[PDB]
């Protein structure tokens, strides 16, 4: 069964999940392995918010450990999403490309809203959600608020209220009440930024509140040990633990009275003494402003959401395919290709093909089928079932197109298709290269919004793309330009 590796790069730490899909095409997975790396990019940002070469080194090291664990488990490629620290760094795009060059993995920045939607799915995989749920996810950089029902987020708000960010924003003095003063000021900042949107996430009869990520997990462990319990490692973690806003307030008042070095010795807060005071003030102030009385902590988060969405995309693509095209996908899988990438390239290829047809481009009847198959097979190294021998030669020549044919036209075994077929191969290859460029970062997120004639050329509007995707289209769209005319890409 399919083995998949997903990872997220946050502000305090990075996380990897390796899992195997469950039989029945039902969108489920079994966990194989998990890893956390204390990357702490938020402590590697200069005054303008740029990630330093030290943070780049810590990023590359995390992604190298991740890539080795995935390879060690047969997972193959690792999809990597990145949140607040890379998102906000003026040099974020340049840093992500440099890290790809050093590790092979590309940390693709996602929006706060998509971060929230995916985190909620991970929470859904770990704890019991009801008809009306509010999730708070506090990281080092940002705080997401998410409201939804039993299956997915309906509303997401992202605010710059992260724990690292707030610790650095409100430097602590050395007085007796210096801790309380930090806690009060952080809470005022929380209310100031949350007041205009709080109604969207406020408690109503029956609302359940949930918390994810490291601060909340540390708070749950520390609160349970204050109730008389053992360290969270017994009971298998803190997943599904509940605590009250009163227990949180009491933990916060205790932390506030201690100096930073004593905070590291509070049970359950041992690995978070430096940011924990501001982090607990954020959670208390935000929950209090929404009227929450009790929370449930979830160990599921962003990486579990990425896995669900990836399996969902793959299995939805596979389900709607014809029997013949499904056998191509199974063949490609046996060739060890990445099925998430192949499905996305084929869906993007169909989208571009269909718009060209709408704008009056002419194609022969089997063109869409040939393009789909070559899109699924494009990364099979072995090959450079419902298809006749001509169609399979066409597919192979589309999948491995080059301007200089590896075998010279005079070389024995050179395969010279008829002129109409030569023309078809290049046009469809030109589409396939543009689609491949749109999933260069392996995010599965790109979408075609519009494709229109622009003089003797074309204008393409896309969403869900990274800087790496946009550059891929520029580099690989030369063939499109030679066959369809100049192509400009937007958004
Ligand atoms: Mg590709």
Residue numbers in the entry: 0 to 383, 402 to 508
Give the exact sentences the study uses for this entry:
Protein crystal structures of PPX homologs from different bacterial species, including DrPPX from Deinoccocus radiodurans, AbPPX from Acinetobacter baumannii, and KpPPX from Klebsiella pneumoniae, were determined and refined to resolutions of 1.8‐2.6 Å, respectively (crystallographic data together with the data collection and refinement statistics were summarized in Table  1). While the KpPPX and AbPPX crystallized as a symmetric dimer, the DrPPX crystallographic structure exhibited an asymmetric homodimer. The AtPPX has a ɑ‐linker consisting of 9 amino acids (Gly298‐Ser306), the KpPPX and HpPPX have ɑ‐linkers of 12 amino acids (Ala296 – Gly307, Gly285‐Leu296, respectively), the EcPPX and AbPPX have ɑ‐linkers of 15 amino acids (Ala296 – Lys310), while the DrPPX has a ɑ‐linker of 20 amino acids (Ala300 – Ala319). Among the PPXs, the DrPPX which contains the longest α‐helical linker exhibited the smallest dimeric interface (1136 Å2) as calculated using the PDBePISA server, while the PPXs with shorter α‐linkers had a larger dimeric interface. The shorter α‐linker (AtPPX, KpPPX, and HpPPX) enabled the C‐terminal domain 3 to interact with domain 2 of the N‐terminal, while the longer α‐linkers (DrPPX, EcPPX, and AbPPX) facilitated the interaction of C‐terminal domain 3 with domain 1 and led to a relatively loose dimer formation. In the DrPPX apo crystals grown in the presence of ammonia sulfate, sulfate ions were observed in the cleft of the N‐terminal domain of the apo structure of DrPPX. In terms of the polyP hydrolysis activity of the PPXs, the DrPPX with the longest ɑ‐linker exhibited the weakest activity, while the KpPPX with the shortest ɑ‐linker showed the strongest activity, demonstrating a strong negative correlation of ɑ‐linker length with PPX activity across the species. Superposition of apo‐ and NTD structures of DrPPX revealed that truncation of the C‐terminal led to an enlargement of the cleft between domain 1 and domain 2 of the N‐terminal.
Degradation of polyP into phosphate is involved in phosphorus cycling, and exopolyphosphatase (PPX) is the key enzyme for polyP degradation in bacteria. The PPX hydrolyzes and releases the Pi progressively from the linear polyP chain. Bacterial PPXs share conserved catalytic domains 1 and 2 belonging to the catalytic N‐domain, and most members of the PPX family contain two additional domains 3 and 4 in the C‐terminal. The exopolyphosphatase belongs to the ASKHA (Acetate and Sugar Kinases, Hsp70, Actin) superfamily protein, which utilizes a common fold for binding and catalyzing hydrolysis of ATP phosphoanhydride.
